[PDB]
Amino acid sequence: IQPVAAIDSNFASFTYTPRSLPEDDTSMAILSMLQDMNFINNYKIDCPTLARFCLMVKKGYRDPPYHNWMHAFSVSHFCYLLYKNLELTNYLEDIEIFALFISCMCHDLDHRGTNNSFQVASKSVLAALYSSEGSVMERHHFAQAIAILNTHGCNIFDHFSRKDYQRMLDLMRDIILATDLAHHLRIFKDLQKMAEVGYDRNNKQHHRLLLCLLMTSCDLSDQTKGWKTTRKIAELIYKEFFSQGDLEKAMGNRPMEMMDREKAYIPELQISFMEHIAMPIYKLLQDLFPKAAELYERVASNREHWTKVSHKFTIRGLPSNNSLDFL
Amino acid sequence: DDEYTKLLHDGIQPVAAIDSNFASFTYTPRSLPEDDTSMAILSMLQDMNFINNYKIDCPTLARFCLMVKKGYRDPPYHNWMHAFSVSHFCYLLYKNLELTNYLEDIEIFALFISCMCHDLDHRGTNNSFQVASKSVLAALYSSEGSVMERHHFAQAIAILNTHGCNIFDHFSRKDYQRMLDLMRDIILATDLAHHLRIFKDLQKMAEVGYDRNNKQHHRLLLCLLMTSCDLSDQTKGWKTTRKIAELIYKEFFSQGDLEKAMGNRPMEMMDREKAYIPELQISFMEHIAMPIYKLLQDLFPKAAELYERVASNREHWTKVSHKFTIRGLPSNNSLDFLD
Numbered sequence: 001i002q003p004v005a006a007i008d009s010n011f012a013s014f015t016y017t018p019r020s021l022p023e024d025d026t027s028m029a030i031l032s033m034l035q036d037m038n039f040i041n042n043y044k045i046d047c048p049t050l051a052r053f054c055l056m057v058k059k060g061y062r063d064p065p066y067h068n069w070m071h072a073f074s075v076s077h078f079c080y081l082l083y084k085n086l087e088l089t090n091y092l093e094d095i096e097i098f099a100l101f102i103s104c105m106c107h108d109l110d111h112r113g114t115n116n117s118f119q120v121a122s123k124s125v126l127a128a129l130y131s132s133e134g135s136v137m138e139r140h141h142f143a144q145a146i147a148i149l150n151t152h153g154c155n156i157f158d159h160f161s162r163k164d165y166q167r168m169l170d171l172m173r174d175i176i177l178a179t180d181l182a183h184h185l186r187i188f189k190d191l192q193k194m195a196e197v198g199y200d201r202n203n204k205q206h207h208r209l210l211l212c213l214l215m216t217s218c219d220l221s222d223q224t225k226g227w228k229t230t231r232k233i234a235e236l237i238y239k240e241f242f243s244q245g246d247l248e249k250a251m252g253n254r255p256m257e258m259m260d261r262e263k264a265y266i267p268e269l270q271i272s273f274m275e276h277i278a279m280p281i282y283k284l285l286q287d288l289f290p291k292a293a294e295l296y297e298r299v300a301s302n303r304e305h306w307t308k309v310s311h312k313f314t315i316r317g318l319p320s321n322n323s324l325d326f327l
Numbered sequence: 328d329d330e331y332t333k334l335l336h337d338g339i340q341p342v343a344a345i346d347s348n349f350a351s352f353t354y355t356p357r358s359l360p361e362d363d364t365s366m367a368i369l370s371m372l373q374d375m376n377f378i379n380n381y382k383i384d385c386p387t388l389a390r391f392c393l394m395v396k397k398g399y400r401d402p403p404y405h406n407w408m409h410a411f412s413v414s415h416f417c418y419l420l421y422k423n424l425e426l427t428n429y430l431e432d433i434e435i436f437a438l439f440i441s442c443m444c445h446d447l448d449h450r451g452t453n454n455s456f457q458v459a460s461k462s463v464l465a466a467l468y469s470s471e472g473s474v475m476e477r478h479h480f481a482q483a484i485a486i487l488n489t490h491g492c493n494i495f496d497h498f499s500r501k502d503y504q505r506m507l508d509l510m511r512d513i514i515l516a517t518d519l520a521h522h523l524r525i526f527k528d529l530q531k532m533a534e535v536g537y538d539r540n541n542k543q544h545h546r547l548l549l550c551l552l553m554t555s556c557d558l559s560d561q562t563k564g565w566k567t568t569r570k571i572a573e574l575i576y577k578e579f580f581s582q583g584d585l586e587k588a589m590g591n592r593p594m595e596m597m598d599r600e601k602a603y604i605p606e607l608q609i610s611f612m613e614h615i616a617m618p619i620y621k622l623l624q625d626l627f628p629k630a631a632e633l634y635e636r637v638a639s640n641r642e643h644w645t646k647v648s649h650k651f652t653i654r655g656l657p658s659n660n661s662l663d664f665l666d
């Protein structure tokens with residue numbers, strides 16, 4: 001019901017930090033964004049159905065440190081930011097943008113704070129079901145979304161045409177699958193070539209690729225805020241990662257270095273992630289949309305901040321307690 | 328008053344009653360409670376026969392020992408337990424190295440008494456700081472150099488010139504002159520700048536062979552022995568050396584803080600924001616401490632274990648240096664400390 005303007009004057013700016021919104025008001029902000037983008041009217045969405053959907057989606061997230069509902073919410077908010085600041089209506093069809101937003105809400109449903117490889121290593125039921133087709137967790141997220149849509153009172157696409165209903169299911173599947181960084185790294189050349197030749201709004205394949213880039217851009221958008229956010233996020237990511245590393249050690253396996261709390265050097269790991277994964281993503285975004293320049297610039301500054309703060313990970317002088325008893 | 332009374336009237340306790348390993352290079356005198364240290368000085372002086380050989384008046388000796396102890400302040404490192412542990416090491420050298428084949432009795436006595444007094448009234452700051460802070464001590468002594476060491480010597484002389492404290496009072500004019508001269512040379516020898524100045528003369532002495540009839544060799548040897556006592560904390564186990572690092576750097580960083588606050592850039596080892604302890608200790612062991620105990624081993628074969636302990640302690644800093652890098656997250660699971 002509520003107008004975005006009342007939530008905060010800065011709500012539609014790239015400088016806004018949606019994790020600042022209390023968690024009890026996030027479901028209202030989802031409705032407020034959908035209304036502001038005018039999807040509820042355009043597609044005649046039943047508001048009580050939408051409300052029950054939004055709540056079910058929220059309740060469908062578990063509470064690991066990073067991959068929780070506040071992540072889903074902030075990913076979705078970034079999608080709204082892209083629509084508001086880049087005017088995506090000029091580049092994508094309306095149904096594509098809508099599918100992208102709903103995918104953002106659902107893209108990590110029922111995440112257990114472990115990656116795909118752990119699911120397979122540990123022979124989880126999710127691995128038995130999905131490991132043969134790849135992207136184990138992402139297939140699960142989509143299957144959870146489907147189960148939500150088919151829960152009584154929650155099918156927001158109840159009334160759609162068969163063409164639109166199907167297009168929505170196909171878009172959500174492909175977009176949610178696109179959240180696997182393995183997928184992104186596989187299409188990275190195709191994304192570059194599209195940016196060279198130039199985005200062809202008449203090209204159905206270019207629509208598919210742009211949707212993948214935009215979804216990745218939403219998934220990593222925490223890195224486009226200030227230092228304070230990036231610092232908190234690293235805190236959350238690494239607690240989640242180290243917890244999986246601990247589980248892998250109890251299994252008699254050697255975790256990859258980034259999940260091993262005894263070997264992980266956070267500044268190196270973060271700088272490499274920022275330089276080799278996050279930056280190229282927002283560089284591609286900047287090439288496609290000149291108005292996305294500031295996003296790339298924040299990611300690069302956040303990366304430069306990590307170098308500037310790296311020295312603090314070596315103890316100089318004595319510890320605060322004037323003892324070397326930590327040795 | 329009551330501390331004196333017991334020192335004088337209870338009798339000097341046998342050195343073996345201090346600890347079964349008291350006369351061993353492995354013993355750590357810092358484990359002796361501070362309240363037992365003045366009696367331990369008396370037992371060491373007795374065991375070395377100095378009390379009887381020099382007919383030292385016991386009331387005077389008791390007063391002198393307490394006055395010396397009272398003349399140390401309590402910075403983290405340069406305090407009475409330093410002077411006590413340094414004196415203990417001198418005792419160790421006497422017991423283990425047969426100094427009597429190298430030095431005169433009066434020279435050994437002078438070394439011990441110098442060890443007791445060699446840091447008197449230290450204020451936890453070095454020579455450079457006295458100059459930079461325009462201290463009273465720099466006003467007195469900076470034109471001659473070794474400012475703190477001249478102060479330590481002057482303090483020791485002032486104790487001896489305190490009524491009832493002159494343990495040498497009955498010495499002949501010549502013997503008294505000799506003792507005070509020895510104390511001056513020995514205490515001045517504790518300025519590491521002096522040590523570094525005479526280091527090549529120490530090497531030449533060690534190469535050609537110690538000549539007991541060479542007066543300059545006696546002088547050189549007294550300097551090296553004093554320096555050896557002064558750094559002797561580094562010849563014990565890893566646990567001692569780690570604690571000693573805590574004390575040194577607390578003292579150094581306090582100075583560096585004062586230096587910043589008066590507009591000067593402290594040395595890296597004094598600067599708690601630049602100092603990397605493992606690397607500083609490795610350098611100190613390699614450039615300062617190991618060469619000293621190597622010289623001592625070259626002169627005294629039974630000193631080998633001292634060098635080997637210093638070399639081992641240098642190796643431990645290499646082994647432990649990785650733990651100064653934070654792997655994973657801190658125990659509180661926060662990165663608060665980055666802001």
Ligand SMILES: Cc1cc(CN2CCC[C@H](c3cc(C(F)F)nc4ncnn34)C2)cc(Cl)n1
Nearest residue numbers: 181219220221222223233234237258269270273
């Ligand atoms: C090469 C690589 C890949 C990954 C994959 N990881 C998957 C889960 C989310 C995670 C992530 C997400 C975000 C997000 F907030 F932008 N920031 C992140 N900063 C470091 N990791 N990280 C990325 C992590 C790292 Cl540290 N390094």
Ligand SMILES: Cc1cc(CN2CCC[C@H](c3cc(C(F)F)nc4ncnn34)C2)cc(Cl)n1
Nearest residue numbers: 557558559560561571575596607608610611615
């Ligand atoms: C090259 C050098 C010289 C110095 C000079 N310093 C004078 C005051 C006593 C000090 C000292 C004395 C002792 C002692 F225990 F042997 N251990 C020490 N470990 C580090 N410093 N240090 C030596 C200190 C350092 Cl860290 N490095």
Ligand SMILES: [Mg+2]
Nearest residue numbers: 107108179180
């Ligand atoms: Mg995911």
Ligand SMILES: [Mg+2]
Nearest residue numbers: 445446517518
């Ligand atoms: Mg001194």
Ligand SMILES: [Zn+2]
Nearest residue numbers: 107108179219
């Ligand atoms: Zn995600």
Ligand SMILES: [Zn+2]
Nearest residue numbers: 409445446557
């Ligand atoms: Zn000293």
